[PDB]
Design a protein around this ligand. Sequence first.
Ligand SMILES: O=P(O)(O)OP(=O)(O)OP(=O)(O)OC[C@H]1O[C@@H](n2cnc3c(NCCc4ccccc4)ncnc32)[C@H](O)[C@@H]1O
Ligand SMILES: O=P(O)(O)OP(=O)(O)OP(=O)(O)OC[C@H]1O[C@@H](n2cnc3c(NCCc4ccccc4)ncnc32)[C@H](O)[C@@H]1O
Ligand SMILES: Nc1ncnc2c1ncn2[C@@H]1O[C@H](COP(=O)(O)OP(=O)(O)NP(=O)(O)O)[C@@H](O)[C@H]1O
Ligand SMILES: [Mg+2]
Ligand SMILES: [Mg+2]
Ligand SMILES: [Mg+2]
Ligand SMILES: [Mg+2]
Lengths: 1182, 309
Amino acid sequence: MQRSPLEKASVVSKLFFSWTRPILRKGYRQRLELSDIYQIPSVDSADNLSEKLEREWDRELASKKNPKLINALRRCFFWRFMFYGIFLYLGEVTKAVQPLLLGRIIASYDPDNKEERSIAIYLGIGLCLLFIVRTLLLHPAIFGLHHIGMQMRIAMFSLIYKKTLKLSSRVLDKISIGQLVSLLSNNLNKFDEGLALAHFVWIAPLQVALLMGLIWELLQASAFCGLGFLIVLALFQAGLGRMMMKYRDQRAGKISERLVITSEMIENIQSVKAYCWEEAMEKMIENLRQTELKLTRKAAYVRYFNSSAFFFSGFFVVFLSVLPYALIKGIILRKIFTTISFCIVLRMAVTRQFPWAVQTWYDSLGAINKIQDFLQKQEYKTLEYNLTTTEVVMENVTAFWEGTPVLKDINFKIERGQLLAVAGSTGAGKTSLLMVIMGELEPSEGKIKHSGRISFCSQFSWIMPGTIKENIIFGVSYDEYRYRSVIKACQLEEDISKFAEKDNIVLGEGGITLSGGQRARISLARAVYKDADLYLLDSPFGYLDVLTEKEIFESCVCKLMANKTRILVTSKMEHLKKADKILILHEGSSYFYGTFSELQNDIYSRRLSISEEINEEDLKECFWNTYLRYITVHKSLIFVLIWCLVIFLAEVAASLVVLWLLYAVIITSTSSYYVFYIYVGVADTLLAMGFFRGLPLVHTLITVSKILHHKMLHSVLQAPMSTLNTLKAGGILNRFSKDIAILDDLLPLTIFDFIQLLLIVIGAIAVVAVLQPYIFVATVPVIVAFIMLRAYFLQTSQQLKQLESEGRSPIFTHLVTSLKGLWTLRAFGRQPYFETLFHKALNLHTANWFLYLSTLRWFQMRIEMIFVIFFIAVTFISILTTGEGEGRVGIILTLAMNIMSTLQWAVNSSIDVDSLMRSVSRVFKFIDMPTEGIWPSGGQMTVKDLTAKYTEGGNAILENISFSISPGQRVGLLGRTGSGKSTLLSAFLRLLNTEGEIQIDGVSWDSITLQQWRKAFGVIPQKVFIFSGTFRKNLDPYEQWSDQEIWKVADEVGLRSVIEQFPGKLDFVLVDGGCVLSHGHKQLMCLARSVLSKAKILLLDQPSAHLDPVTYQIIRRTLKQAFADCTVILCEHRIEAMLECQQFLVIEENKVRQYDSIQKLLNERSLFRQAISPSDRVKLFP
Amino acid sequence: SVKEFLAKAKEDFLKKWENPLDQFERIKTLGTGSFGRVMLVKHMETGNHYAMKILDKQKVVKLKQIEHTLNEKRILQAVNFPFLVKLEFSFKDNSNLYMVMEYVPGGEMFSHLRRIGRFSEPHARFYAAQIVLTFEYLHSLDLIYRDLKPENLLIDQQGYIQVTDFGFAKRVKGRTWTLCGTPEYLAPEIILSKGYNKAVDWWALGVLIYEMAAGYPPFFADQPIQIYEKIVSGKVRFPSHFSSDLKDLLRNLLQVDLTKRFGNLKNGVNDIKNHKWFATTDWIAIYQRKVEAPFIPKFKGPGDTSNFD
Ligand SMILES: O=P(O)(O)OP(=O)(O)OP(=O)(O)OC[C@H]1O[C@@H](n2cnc3c(NCCc4ccccc4)ncnc32)[C@H](O)[C@@H]1O
Ligand SMILES: O=P(O)(O)OP(=O)(O)OP(=O)(O)OC[C@H]1O[C@@H](n2cnc3c(NCCc4ccccc4)ncnc32)[C@H](O)[C@@H]1O
Ligand SMILES: Nc1ncnc2c1ncn2[C@@H]1O[C@H](COP(=O)(O)OP(=O)(O)NP(=O)(O)O)[C@@H](O)[C@H]1O
Ligand SMILES: [Mg+2]
Ligand SMILES: [Mg+2]
Ligand SMILES: [Mg+2]
Ligand SMILES: [Mg+2]
């Protein structure tokens, strides 16, 4: 994309939007390609717009005692808003004076209207240019208002994201990803296009006054009956608006909960597949969809009654204000038609425009005040910066998260260059001490003193989208030698050689492509690359086998960076020997502090101190029977539609019979033509849909969306693992938030309105044509053109709508990846980099959002131009042929345009319906996603020539394996960090593209359905899955056990005093990924789940990931006690864990080797045998 | 009080304005700089240590800066204020010109700024208040300083600022056209070679506060011609650790438009002194140095020069 033509177009061209023609003509013939998009205008860039708003927001904060957010918005846009409002007012005023001319032109078709005819030519000339004036003053103002709304939305979004990065940890627990996604999704498109309606608050009364003054010309004092009726109806509509706002504000709560559950469940699809919980989650989400539907369907009835007032009021307003005048004195038939002509505009002004404007204000001001409240929360205060301290001092520090203090009487001191090793049991406070040092957990007592320049290696490894190189350098200047030394010292070169594109391999969000140890070592390399005073290493040696762990500890920590003052969290009696000071914690208090001896009693030299624009690459990933599939998905909707058509035909027949069959009114054969004019001008009420036909349609159209949502969720949960990686987190959030909110709220009422207008047009034409068939012939050229232009526009508008629909996924994926790395971002200090990335994504969205509005305005201006030219052309021929008596020609031709006055509005509604139908097309694409795919007795298992690869036609990870497991025999699976050892035990579950034969117990794995095959395997995933809910719901999401057998299991795994330390025993609400629990307790929770579900086959992958030996004894005892009779595959790096197993399977160079002895295994590999600690070497060898 | 004090200062300044090397040691050199050098001297008769700024006459005439030196001498004579370094004796020799200034042991603030990296907001505000008072006093006398930079401001024993180097100063009522100064600290109007007035020192104060709070100047580039482009563009991005209040203050001070420049509109100094960022600084007490300094430089006697290079 390049060089937006808007900036370099002429004034006459942009008055008519002729500059958008090339992208319509290139795209009518064949697919709109990435070369056809344009650059964003320079004024519309997110960079120079958020700064322009915050310039005034900071001034408001620093100057006022009671700051309001709506004063920066006012003093940024007020004049340019009012400037278009002024012209929009004369776009309305010129509409109400049309009857003054038109009811005189029609009146001329009468022999005895002597003076009226004599001057009609000048009235026709005056009407000719009034249309030209009216069409020009209206559209540019509306387009400018749309642009102003877009700019306001962009600025507020950028300000909100810039605010987010500096929130305190206290308020983080109150702000989940679902709340932010709901906040930014509910305003993403409605806010831009809603700005055009706000001005009608002050236009509508100034219009009603004018219309009442004009009606006083006709009806004298009797006109006020319609005014009173309309005022009563407006009051009723205001009450309906109150009720509808109530229901929406009540409903808002559950959406965030359902969204966070959905995102957590889809991200961890691996564990859901392994546990076979792919049916419990559907029930959990359905139970929350039920109440949300119960509220939205109740609000829809109020929306219907609010939208139905226009159609029904048409007849009563006219009747009630012209009946008393006729009752007293005889009236001419012409006055009724003139009154109807004014009353149509009065009805539109009162009943349709004003309440929409009032609702627009109630929504916009509520959103602005919500953002204003968001901006005033607690902020993380930065640590003091001082380059000359050379010493870390901690003294008398105690801390509370909110009873028992987390830390109590903690103090230590270390000089430049010293290594201090933190040790202690699980849950003692090891990580919270690093959180206190980093300044996230500000201590209640004491002080902390250091340089303020730190580097952090989180215990939970974090990876954001990009390559390995970009992840390691992490937004700093590239260096050739520093990077090579870092990537070599971490033993990571061994694994880079396996990847196809080496260092440039693209990693997805969360690094799901990589193994555990690879991701941990990438985070370690990122920590090492950063130049800082203090290094905070939070147990990087968790997932690494002893050889690689020992090599990394010797080479990197102790030799490459021997001049830094690093802090290493470790629980091995080999690392404490190398350290200078030892700190041991227990139950939160300090147990020991001193030298190791008392316990028994220049590569990294220094370091010195992005485009905001889309060039070509960023806009690359973005690149009729849908109605039938939507209609036929629900069987009752067809019956409802047939019912509607039956009643429509009955009404049409009755109206035709009455009109064929025909004091207080003066009517003569000379002026009898007004009957059809009055019928056409009042047909809006006779052929309207009452609630007997309105309410069932709205009810069924909402019942459809629940079926669509349930089907989409079911199809997502059944997809094969290979195709789920092609998706992104932002696409999931997009499709479950926006394309479901649209499906519930906007679509039913818009379809209702479109159907109503279409039925009115068809009924009017059908009834009026039968009595004398020449309107139908006279109306063909307009009907044909209104369809030809619509097709020509839609051919490109569909593609533009699709491209805009995919532009908003990067926003959500950036938003979801930002919150996971917040502590790492603030520790490293990379906020401007992520702000620039988010502004780039915003510009990417705006580039596609702008062209859709430009083309829509072009179309809506062309259709009114066609109407104007046909009106002028027909008016001149109508008036020319009134040569002194019985203007037959005009009676037909002028009547032929009152139908088009509403057919144009029906065609305008058709484009809205089609635009909103794109979400249905995007939803159906997810349903069509391909689907994946006592007996256990003993557990004897046999494989033959098993091969596994993650992608079909890809590179094989392992092949040609023929081992055999005896019943009830422990198998110790072993290997280096990254070998295929997890792939071997994942192939038993058939989660990846596999080939071969597995013969568990004698029944071939191909002879059983997947859901019955996979049930026999009890698993402990390496990736612990904790979802929002209660402890009881976490331990069994089926409720098939009740509180006694749960306590009988939880105490074995040492969870007694871990659960009971919370206010709700077995009922505490775990939130935000279960962050309340320590990392060591999550392993015990997974072990408890495995203990509850007694299966004959067990696949334990890293059962003891981080816990120290004093806690590992629990895992040992429960492995020997709870399921001693079951066969288990024990994949683990702990050497002590390979003392119980009696068969071993070592994986090396993509094939397996079997050993039925542990002594023989160590003899054939010297380096591994020489790396184990002496403590285990004397346990193994006698 | 303050108005009467300023009237008295302006009244007594005029009386001194209209009425304008064998007793010195060469123990140390405290940085030469430009034409000449400043050497440390010790008073034989009393023992008080002083500075001694030498100036080259041939370089003065060659560089076409002769008015600068003479009016510098005469101004540094006439002015009297606690935060300005006072001149005691003036020399006139056939080789060079020498001026004796009172010794300031604490050395440069620039060294401390490059040593610590950056000051916290109260630490910056403490010096900002003193600079605001100094500019109020100087502008009350119709003087222009026009060479504010961290390399001109020393630190005394107690920790207060000591202003030196009045070379480019000038007493003027109205408009001036002379171009001079350090490229990052130049205002847009002087860059454009147009007439400019006393408002430039507020731009210098804004850029000084930005540099002191962040550790690096806002408008910074390789070539001087690029720095001029960045200055005339007027576009700047603030770092994360800046508070909203200080951001507003710097946006008002560093504004390109001369008319709406802060400290120039309608009240002169009250727009700045009443700002929210100075809500907790008692001006009357800080004038009389009754507040505790947040940084006290270690001096090891009158002869110690460990703070200097
Ligand atoms: O992982 P290990 O095996 O190596 O042991 P450990 O490192 O020492 O475990 P610790 O991290 O030190 O946790 C120590 C205790 O503190 C509790 N605890 C932990 N997090 C707690 C919490 N969270 C609110 C603050 C918060 C945390 C994360 C993200 C946002 C906000 N609110 C309240 N109590 C929280 C936790 O149950 C523990 O009993
Ligand atoms: O924790 P450790 O220290 O014990 O390491 P490990 O146990 O041996 O881990 P392994 O899985 O054996 O890693 C083995 C190799 O396979 C690659 N690899 C691993 N997982 C990969 C992957 N996953 C996404 C597709 C998928 C399909 C089915 C189920 C889950 C994920 N998509 C693509 N390549 C994937 C990975 O780069 C490795 O080079
Ligand atoms: N009163 C003083 N006591 C002690 N040292 C001083 C004093 N005034 C200046 N100095 C030191 O001497 C150096 C030069 O003095 P200075 O007054 O700035 O002459 P200058 O040539 O005009 N400086 P410049 O224009 O930047 O090149 C400064 O860097 C100070 O460190
Ligand atoms: Mg931990
Ligand atoms: Mg693994
Ligand atoms: Mg000098
Ligand atoms: Mg100097």
